[PDB]
Amino acid sequence: NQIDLNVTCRYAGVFHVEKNGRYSISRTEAADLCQAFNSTLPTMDQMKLALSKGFETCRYGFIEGNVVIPRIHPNAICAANHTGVYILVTSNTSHYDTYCFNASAPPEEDCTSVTDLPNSFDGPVTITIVNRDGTRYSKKGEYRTHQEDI
Ligand SMILES: CN(C)CCCN1CCc2cccc(N)c2C1
Numbered sequence: 726n727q728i729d730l731n732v733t734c735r736y737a738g739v740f741h742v743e744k745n746g747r748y749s750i751s752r753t754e755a756a757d758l759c760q761a762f763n764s765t766l767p768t769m770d771q772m773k774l775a776l777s778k779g780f781e782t783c784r785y786g787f788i789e790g791n792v793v794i795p796r797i798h799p800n801a802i803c804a805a806n807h808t809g810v811y812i813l814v815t816s817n818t819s820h821y822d823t824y825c826f827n828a829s830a831p832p833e834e835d836c837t838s839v840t841d842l843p844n845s846f847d848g849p850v851t852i853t854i855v856n857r858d859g860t861r862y863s864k865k866g867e868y869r870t871h872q873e874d875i
Contacts, residue, residue: 727851730758733782734836734857735827739767739775741782743822748785754874755787755823761845761868764825765789771826772810778833785813786822793824842866 733741742758744750750758759765766789767775776795783803785792792813794804804811838860842852848867855861869875 726849727853729853729855730842731855731857732839734780734834735830736775736778736780736834737771737832738764738827738830739771739780739824740764740827740830740839741784741786741822741824743784743786748821750787750823751820751871751874752787753871754869755821757868757870757874758823759825761842761866762825762827762839763829763844764827767824767826769793769810772824776810784822786824788824792816792821838862842868844868 729745731743731746756766766787768789772788772793772795776797780795781797782794783800785794794811796804796808796811799806799808838856838858839854840862842854842864845852845864845866845868849865850867851863852866853861853863
């Protein structure tokens with residue numbers, strides 16, 4: 726009964742989270758997951774500012790109202806070689822990664838590790854934050870509020 730949350734550097738407060746390293750987060754679960762990080766789904770404007778500070782990924786994830794990939798460098802296998810905030814237009818499927826926005830983060834690039842899930846609630850799941858440098862933090866808890874997500 727274990728969940729890995731792979732997290733990125735923050736850029737202007739925006740970061741990416743993958744659950745178990747596979748596309749597996751619903752839109753409802755995304756909101757709950759950000760809430761557990763004392764964060765919200767980013768707006769498009771927040772994401773554009775994060776991009777301007779150096780944020781890019783090669784993964785689709787939820788923001789407020791869209792599923793996107795921030796891209797700085799063109800890469801053929803990431804967002805069909807686009808740059809900017811690439812918006813997913815057509816997909817059959819509902820489960821992605823998520824982006825999250827924490828207003829209390831530093832204003833530019835913050836590539837320090839994430840050390841807590843401050844707003845997780847009591848629960849039976851071993852939740853492990855996994856940083857890109859391998860640093861891990863674990864706690865027992867839960868963050869999912871919708872039954873359909875568990
Ligand atoms: C999911 N694969 C295909 C590539 C996406 C990059 N992942 C790779 C796995 C990983 C592990 C810890 C932290 C982070 N940010 C990441 C990011």
